[PDB]
Amino acid sequence: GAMNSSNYAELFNNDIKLFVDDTNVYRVTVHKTFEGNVATKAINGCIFTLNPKTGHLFLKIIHTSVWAGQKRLSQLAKWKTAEEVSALVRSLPKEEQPKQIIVTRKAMLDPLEVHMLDFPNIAIRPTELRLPFSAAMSIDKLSDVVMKATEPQMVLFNIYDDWLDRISSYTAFSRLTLLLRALKTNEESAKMILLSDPTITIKSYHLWPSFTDEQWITIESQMRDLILTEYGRKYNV
Amino acid sequence: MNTVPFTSAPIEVTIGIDQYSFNVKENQPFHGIKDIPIGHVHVIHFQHADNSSMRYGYWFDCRMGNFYIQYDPKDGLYKMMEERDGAKFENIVHNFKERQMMVSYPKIDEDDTWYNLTEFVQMDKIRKIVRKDENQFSYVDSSMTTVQENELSDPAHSLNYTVINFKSREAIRPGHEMEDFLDKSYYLNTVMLQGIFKNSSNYFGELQFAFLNAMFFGNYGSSLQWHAMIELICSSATVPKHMLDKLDEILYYQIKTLPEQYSDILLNERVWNICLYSSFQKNSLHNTEKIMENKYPELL
């Protein structure tokens, strides 16, 4: 069934599972043509496939050349996502294949179901959570590797850096979703908060700064305040 | 013209023959149906006045034998049987007519309804869906489940319709995942028509039989099967022109014949809205679309 607030701790048990977010798979700019009509230009995108227990991220970069000569690209994007997710599962040893795949958007169920027909014991699930994984391209290192790619490419990351040496999966995922929620609501402020202190650097093999435990507390409070402020502004509350 | 005599009518029951039906009172002297048109399948069905649940009945073809009805007080229902003694059977039929205790199959001569609902239904195919090979007629009732339903418990009593499943390996070629799921032509034409049904007439026959079982017995898995086979054609970009035109006639008479008050359970909103308005074949069901709008504009 669907994933929600009730069955949220299931994400951190020992059944292997992946989230798939397709929001950044087909990305365009919209512009005016010489004759004043509107046209789109595609830029590189990515599939965001994440194991929330371990932090392992399988960033499949989607090169604009995929779209060349194709129609109904937003529909195609769903099938290409499902094609690539299926190929990733096939590539993994049996004992690493997930028991569930949770798609962040319901329009992905049928394409993935059809591509996973060879895996009848892998359950494809929607979710009722409003996960902020579209803000993945607000993480500077991920956006950079997507935009520089010249061919289809899978890049692997741990999205939790080394946090799990000191905190549980549950807490790690809560930090990740808070950070991404803030980046989504006000990218400029979110990023200011993270980088203001130039003495706190990002390791070459990490995505986020090397905050101490106490600095993470101050950061997390600052991101909560950002999110609440933007809400009152959005709704006049 | 043929006759299906009844030994007696011990219990109050509504008797249908094809689309016609009669009320018969407990121990009323009712003794059969005569003038039944040779050349088509037929169905004689029952609903006891005391249990408006379990509609049940028998598919038969009079060319295949002499058949009659007899109430069983142990099993509590009217049973179809075969009389092998030809002479003994004409003897019973002639005496009952002489006494005029039989209703005449009430066909209006202008009416092709029954022909149109049964054009492709052949008794031989029925008996493969309802396997019970010691009888030449087939029993069906309100509660019988299909083979596909069972998979998701007693198989002797199953409706062995052809299983259609849009999210199966059968339906989807590896490497044509998106193509085949959006355009079911390969499933319709290669897998089902050429592969399993051999030709469109056997396909249409199962479709019509599924519809009739849903209409006459409220058989829910039959309704599912009828809608599935409709959706499979409508969801295919490449359909023989002869099938599309025959399909529009088939569905027209099915929609025309349905009881108005049952449109809520027997008609699946998504399937029809998709077939008539979204599908590849939206523009190919002009009569079916016209009757649907003028009769059930709500469902749409």
UniProtKB/Swiss-Prot annotation, chain A:
Positions of region (RNase H homology domain): 7-237
Source species, domain of life: Eukaryota
Localization: Nucleus
Effect on the protein upon substituting residue 105 to K: Severely impaired growth. Reduced growth at 30 degrees Celsius. Strongly reduced growth at 16 degrees Celsius
Function: Functions as a scaffold that mediates the ordered assembly of spliceosomal proteins and snRNAs. Required for association of BRR2 with the spliceosomal U5 snRNP, and the subsequent assembly of the U4/U6-U5 tri-snRNP complex. Functions as a scaffold that positions spliceosomal U2, U5 and U6 snRNAs at splice sites on pre-mRNA substrates, so that splicing can occur. Interacts with both the 5' and the 3' splice site, as well as the branch region. Has a role in branch site-3' splice site selection. Associates with the branch site-3' splice 3'-exon region. Also has a role in cell cycle.
Miscellaneous comment as given in the Swiss-Prot or TrEMBL entry: Present with 468 molecules/cell in log phase SD medium.
Assembly and binders: Component of the U4/U6-U5 tri-snRNP complex composed of the U4, U6 and U5 snRNAs and at least PRP3, PRP4, PRP6, PRP8, PRP18, PRP31, PRP38, SNU13, SNU23, SNU66, SNU114, SPP381, SMB1, SMD1, SMD2, SMD3, SMX2, SMX3, LSM2, LSM3, LSM4, LSM5, LSM6, LSM7, LSM8, BRR2 and DIB1.
Domain-level remarks: The MPN (JAB/Mov34) domain has structural similarity with deubiquitinating enzymes, but lacks the residues that would bind the catalytic metal ion.
Name of the protein described by the UniProt record: Pre-mRNA-splicing factor 8
Organism: Saccharomyces cerevisiae (strain ATCC 204508 / S288c)
UniProtKB/Swiss-Prot annotation, chain B:
Subcellular location: Cytoplasm; Nucleus
GO CC terms in record: cytoplasm; U5 snRNP
Keywords: Cytoplasm, mRNA processing, mRNA splicing, Nucleus, Phosphoprotein
UniProt modified residues of type Phosphoserine: 236
Classification via Pfam families: AAR2, AAR2_1st
Modified residues (Phosphothreonine): 257
Outcome following mutation: residue 236 to A: No effect on interaction with PRP8
Region (Leucine-zipper): 244-265
Post-translational note: Phosphorylated on serine and tyrosine residues.
GO terms (BP aspect): spliceosomal snRNP assembly; spliceosomal tri-snRNP complex assembly
Family, similarity comment: Belongs to the AAR2 family.
Note: Present with 7330 molecules/cell in log phase SD medium.
Quaternary organization: Heterodimer. Interacts with PRP8 (via RNase H homology domain and MPN domain), competing with BRR2 for the same binding site. Component of a U5 snRNP complex that contains at least the U5 snRNA, PRP8, SNU114, AAR2, SMB1, SMD1, SMD2, SMD3, SME1, SMX2 and SMX3, but is not a component of the U4/U6-U5 tri-snRNP complex.
Name under which the protein is recorded: A1 cistron-splicing factor AAR2
Gene that specifies this protein: AAR2
